Symmetry: C3
Subunit: 308 residues, 3 copies
């Protein structure tokens, strides 16, 4: 069989993504009913940078599939230094049945996936966060039912990992995705083109605008994220002033549909991209969204393992 | 409705007895209780690493059928925009209990008020209540009934072990004495809490600088690392001459690591009064019992 | 009556054969032996980290039904806060075996002198006996019976792999040659122990500076990194003495036509071994790495039932 990887959201077709999201709902109801890793079989979980959500959701998810996660903080290792990534991938493929990797550049994930003989999963990278968007889609479906035709708007830095993955994963689900971002902070052009092409297949659409109020009007789902990642703290830009009109506050939420929901990949900076009132209010689905990392990632692993 | 265990008197006398009974049952049948079968998760977070805390909790949780997600001190520093409150809310969606080794009690109190799962103090600046559960299990299996025994702690009377031996000890009905020099005495609100709890159990609290008087007639003698900056503590060294003053069949306890030659001697710690190895083992059984008990009440 | 595995000759020839047979059985049926069901614990302690040692032991212990408790070098090093003897007595109350990667051999001896459970050397300055069990399992699955094979190791002749290939190799009846430059020769006590064990098994020990001779007629060619992290600041040029001992296509071509190549990871391609050799048809390095899992599981099963 072809070995399947999941490095970006569009690695699943629309039909394949629907299968994974249905499995995520099934596993949330019956969390130990799928045991493909019984043995236990191993799964590598490798962190170039720590993440509470990523650590807990993957380590426990793998265990609940019957497996054993070998969790590596690569700062305590000589990854990239003492041997080639190609050599590392070949050795890993002898010990584990899948490789879960939180890293920075997408080309490293690509390299690992081209030589590993087991599925490689992007746990979080500079360019994409496709596991978070699977959890987001599960959360939206839980609240709203069918994803096809919903309107989702994302606010803030339009070129970070969540903007890119909401574009790709959202249109794969048939969602009309709007990115509201200031000029200079727009989605990567190749990602945007990929999302526009995928949107043709599902009847979705891609909109990019600097008009935050227009983006909010009529939306079913409002999303934001931190305006700055760790790598961008030293990029030289004022990363507050451009984004202030894009804050997800009560005024913005009130422009959306009356039962709109709010998502935010953690962590959050209350007072910057989102306010206390919204973050902690009745429209917020942030905690269910975090919990669904566990269920959605389990579903993804089950699906990749059986196809690989 | 969620119970926490952040200091020894979070358990009433009757609840402490239940936990200690369960610890004895679990020591006999270590995989007979599987409340975390699945596995269900438990967070084990170290703001400062502790190898023996990691072994006892990580294996104990596994023997309850669960899976401990262990976060070492390197991984415990919160990145940009992370917060303790948001951490507690997220952990409550992934795990069934939170075990935390941290410093100030204020952090534990905050985690407990936000989390919707039980929070356990694995070890903190002010208290080490899981060690004292293991200590009480050790005393009980060697001496039977805890009520009315005399226990003396020697050395730094201001540290977490002194506070927990006071609170956990009087909760079990034990007459507790702390022998310590004047700059190193129990925190006064802990002392007053221990004196109050002792009225309910028939116990008592004594604080003295007289190590001789503290040892005389003692049934249990306890010490801990003292950390010259250590001169005030030398008169409190738990040595062979101090042990000679205790009741017959007295037992010696020491939460590890021991620095032989300082707070305790080779002769006392390798001698027939020593229970320090059984004590260390009982961290496993007592903490498993505590977890079983908290989970069933939460 | 508690058995430890601190160096390769802690197993007799017959005992080593039992462990290697079990490694082959466990490779076939990896969850058929559950001596640690419960789970029972096993300590896996690193004074210096080894992620590859971590993968193989953590998963191997789990597949025996147990739970590995892993301690990395980010905690207070064992022996600093309390005696190693006190540490062994406490660990013995929590776990059924102690797996430890440390530095000098005296530390392993100290822990094993007191522990009431088996102590296993995961990797040390002087020996790497678990890697050589994996190597012997690999050689056996590629070549059959080990007795009488000719194995040559090239490079730093006084490191842990050179010492363990000597001891573990002659225990299996393999004729072992170490090809190394002057100043980098096997420890004399290890060589003498290997020579004595070789008299029981029909094996032999050869130490030579002639790489061509070492390679000629060899069934197995082995190398390792020329320098450990601890050696980077020892003051020596640790490249120029070893260039004649590079395991390259020229050198491989002198060996038997069916020769295989081993290298415990990681490899520094272009130094001790070339890309052509690493990635060519004689290389068994990836099976070798996999067999760390199986050989260490067999060792654990065997030690637990003897203790
Ligand atoms: N995982 C990560 C992490 C860091 C700090 C903390 O207090 C808790 C955690 F789960
Ligand atoms: N870092 C991570 C990691 C995982 C497996 C391995 O063989 C080496 C590594 F550095």
């Amino acid at each position: 069989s072809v070995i399947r990887h999941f490095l970006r959201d569009d690695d699943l077709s629309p039909a394949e993504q629907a299968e994974v999201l249905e499995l995520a709902a099934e596993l949330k109801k019956d969390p130990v009913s799928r045991r493909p890793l019984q043995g236990p079989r191993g799964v590598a979980v490798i962190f170039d940078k720590n993440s509470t959500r990523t650590r807990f959701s993957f380590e426990l998810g793998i265990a609940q599939l019957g497996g054993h996660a070998v969790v590596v903080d690569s700062g305590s290792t000589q990854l990239g230094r003492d041997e080639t990534l190609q050599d590392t991938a070949k050795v890993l493929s002898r010990y584990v049945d899948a490789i879960v990797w939180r890293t920075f550049g997408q080309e490293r994930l690509d390299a690992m996936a081209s030589v590993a003989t087991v599925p490689v999963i992007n746990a979080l990278s500079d360019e994409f966060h496709p596991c978070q968007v699977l959890a987001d889609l599960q959360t939206i479906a839980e609240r709203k039912g069918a994803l096809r035709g919903l309107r989702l708007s994302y606010f803030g830095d339009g070129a970070n990992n969540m903007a890119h993955s909401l574009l790709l994963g959202g249109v794969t689900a048939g969602i009309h995705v709007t990115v509201a971002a200031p000029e200079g902070f727009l989605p990567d052009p190749s990602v945007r083109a990929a999302a526009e092409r995928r949107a043709q297949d599902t009847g979705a659409s891609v909109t990019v605008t600097a008009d935050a109020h227009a983006a909010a009007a009529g939306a079913d789902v409002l999303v934001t994220d931190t305006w700055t990642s760790m790598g961008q703290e030293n990029d030289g830009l004022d990363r507050v002033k451009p984004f202030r009109p894009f804050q997800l506050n009560s005024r913005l939420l009130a422009l959306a549909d009356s039962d709109a929901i709010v998502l935010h990949c953690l962590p959050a900076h209350r007072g910057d991209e989102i306010t206390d009132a919204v973050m902690d209010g009745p429209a917020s689905a942030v905690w269910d969204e975090a919990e669904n990392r566990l269920h959605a990632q389990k579903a993804l692993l089950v699906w990749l393992l059986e196809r690989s």
